[PDB]
Amino acid sequence: LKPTTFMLKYDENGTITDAVDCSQNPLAELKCSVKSFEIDKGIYQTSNF
Amino acid sequence: TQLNRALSGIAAEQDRNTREVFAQVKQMYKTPTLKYFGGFNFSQILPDP
Ligand SMILES: *[C@@H]1O[C@H](CO)[C@@H](O[C@@H]2O[C@H](CO)[C@@H](O)[C@H](O)[C@H]2NC(C)=O)[C@H](O)[C@H]1NC(C)=O
Ligand SMILES: *[C@@H]1O[C@H](CO)[C@@H](O[C@@H]2O[C@H](CO)[C@@H](O)[C@H](O)[C@H]2NC(C)=O)[C@H](O)[C@H]1NC(C)=O
């Protein structure tokens, strides 16, 4: 177990249906920012380096 | 996070303010070699190639 950051989507009944690692790749580092799973075309802003 | 959304929100309108002025032009025309259109001299207004 490692201390990373996950985003979780809950259903209508409080069941975890899907999850995203916020430290896997830059695409999934983006989904944790806007709080969505499907993200439109453009430049979005993420964390700085 | 909230500060960089504010300044990049300001910065994005500085592209929109410039496109709504100069980019009213569908097509690029060539520079005419003629510069006295009836004696009206136009070398100072056209770009000097
Ligand atoms: C959340 O749980 C409820 C149960 O309380 C689900 O509702 C039932 O779903 C079954 C199968 O779809 C139906 O046959 C029942 O008629 C439903 N009952 C009611 C009262 O709605 C519901 O589908 C669950 N939702 C999610 C997203 O898991
Ligand atoms: C438009 O006016 C300009 C004024 O600068 C004229 O340019 C000069 O013309 C003289 C004589 O033709 C030349 O000796 C200079 O070298 C020119 N200067 C430059 C910067 O080019 C130009 O001839 C005029 N054009 C027309 C069509 O009337």
Burial status of residue A33 (CB atoms within 10 A of its CB: 0-12, 13-18, 19 or more): middle
Ligand 1 pocket, A12 CB below 6 A?
Answer: yes
| Nearest residue to B4 (alpha-carbon basis) of A44, A27, A5 | A44
Going from the Cα of B49 to the center of ligand 2, the distance in angstroms, rounded, reads 14
B23-36: buried (b, 16+ CB within 10 Å) or exposed (e) per residue? eeeeeeeeeeeeee
Q: DSSP characters for A1-46?
A: -----EEEEE-TTS-EEEEEETTS-HHHHHHHHHT-SS--SS----
Q: Answer yes or no: is the C-beta of B33 below 6 A from any ligand 2 atom.
A: no
From chain B, pick out residues whose CB is under 8 angstroms from the CB of A45: 4-5, 8
H or E element that contains B29: none
Give CA A5 to chain center in angstroms: 9
Q: How far is A44 from B10, CA to CA, in rounded Å? A: 15
Amino acid type, B28 = M
**Which residues on adjacent β-strands are paired with residue A16?**
A10
Amino acid at position A4, single letter = T
Q: Give me the resolution in angstroms, 1 decimal.
A: 3.8
The residue among B4, B5, B10 with the most chain A CBs within 10 A of its CB, best to mutate, is B4
Experimental method used, please? Answer: cryo-EM
Are the beta carbons of A30 and A42 closer than 8 angstroms?
A: no
Asked if residue B48 lies in contact with residue B35, where contact means CB atoms within 8 angstroms, the answer is no
Query: How far, in Å, CA of B6 to CA of A24, rounded?
Result: 28
